[PDB]
Amino acid sequence: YHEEFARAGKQAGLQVWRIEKLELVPVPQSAHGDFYVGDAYLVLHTAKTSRGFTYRLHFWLGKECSQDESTAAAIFTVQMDDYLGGKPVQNRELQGYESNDFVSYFKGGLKYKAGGVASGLNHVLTNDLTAKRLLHVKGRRVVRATEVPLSWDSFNKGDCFIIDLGTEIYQWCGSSCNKYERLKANQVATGIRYNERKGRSELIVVEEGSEPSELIKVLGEKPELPDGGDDDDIIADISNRKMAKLYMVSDSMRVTVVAEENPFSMAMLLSEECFILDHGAAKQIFVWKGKDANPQERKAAMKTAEEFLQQMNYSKNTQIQVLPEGGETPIFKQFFKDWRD
């Protein structure tokens, strides 16, 4: 019913919408990758196949968005899903914990902008040039630029920071950060100048201990810098250990174990029921919904999955992927020894 659903999934490519006071508002192509820290988004990826149209539906939740702001995103995803006839694959995306597939849609990386709809902020593209902000650039695999308070308190020796003053962008490189971190932060700074300023802006690379007068004017005198925190985010352990479990959901919700170790057999998946493939140790849980399974139980898959994490004492930041029968992902299918299409 909401106007945009009519625009959704018509042709191949990526479509980003931001939930603005219970309404779907498109996010322009240039703004793709920028997400407000206090907002909820809907990301739809359309793939053309011979005949077929394959959908990868994602709902991104901001760190500062409310419980009710999060609820609206979940409803919109359910409405979008049945609007697309239960053909799409749904994913709950959490800020700083989003999946590889979601991450792969934005080549320049992710930009976490402070504020949101409550601060009156828009994705409406502007020449701008009046901007004053600070971006903390972190991550080796995935480049994440986070909007941090524009002061020396945010700073650390081991990382790269981008001071965006509008007409000029400063790439502050910490004394103890390597070549890879410098290049990645540069790509973000080049991204602002070209994408947001149209190349009018000027890029100045700044070294710690050598900051210009303009920088120390806004920021003030530079004090001692804390040693760069080593994030060393958890990386999947490679072994011959079979860490996945197969569960069947029996309506609150009751989980019954099907298989105590992967590889699973395709026959275990019954069209009459909803299943949970647990790979919680590797940060991923999958909700497989049978074609002849109860429709009310199918719609509550996201809620069922969140309850599963809580019951099995997993982190609330575990990746949730909801799959319809026949719309299984290559990652889900590979847990099976006898997968047949």
Numbering used by the authors: 6 to 256, 260 to 349
Give passages from the manuscript.
Adseverin (also known as scinderin) is a member of the gelsolin superfamily of Ca2+-dependent actin-binding proteins, which regulate cytoskeletal dynamics by severing, bundling and capping of actin filaments. Adseverin is composed of six GH domains (A1–A6) and shares 60% overall sequence identity with gelsolin (G1–G6). Adseverin was first identified in chromaffin cells of bovine adrenal medulla, where it acts as an actin depolymerizing agent that disassembles the cortical network of actin filaments in response to bursts of intracellular calcium, leading to exocytosis of secretary vesicles. Crystallographic studies revealed that these binding events involve the association of eight calcium ions, six of which bind at a conserved site on each domain (type II), whereas the remaining two are also stabilized by contacts with actin (type I; refs 17, 18, 19, 20). Both proteins are able to sequester two monomers of actin, as well as sever and cap actin filaments through distinct Ca2+-induced domain rearrangements of the two halves of the molecule.
We crystallized A1–A3 in the presence of EGTA, revealing a compact auto-inhibited structure similar to the conformational state observed in inactive full-length gelsolin. Purified recombinant A1–A3, supplemented with 5 mM EGTA, crystallized in space group C2 and its structure was solved by molecular replacement using the structure of G1–G3 excised from inactive full-length gelsolin as the search model and refined to a resolution of 2.9 Å. Each domain adopts the classic GH fold, which is organized around a central five-stranded mixed β-sheet sandwiched between a long α-helix running approximately parallel to the strands, and a shorter α-helix running approximately perpendicular to the strands. The domains adopt the compact arrangement characteristic of inactive gelsolin, with A1 sandwiched between A2 and A3. In this inactive conformation, the long α-helix of A3 is kinked to enable the formation of the A1/A3 latch, resulting in the masking of the major actin-binding interface on A1. The structure appears to be relatively rigid, with B-factors indicating that flexibility is limited mainly to the extended A2A3 linker and the short α-helices of A1 and A2. The inactive forms of A1–A3 (iA1–A3) and G1–G3 (iG1–G3) are highly similar with an overall root mean squared deviation (r.m.s.d.) in Cα positions of 1.19 Å over 337 aligned residues, highlighting the structural conservation between gelsolin and adseverin. The iA1–A3 crystal lattice is stabilized by a number of crystal contacts, including a relatively large packing interface of ∼1,518 Å2. Interestingly, comparisons with full-length gelsolin show that this interface largely buries the surfaces in iA1–A3 that bind the C-terminal half of the molecule, suggesting that the crystal environment partially mimics the inactive full-length protein.
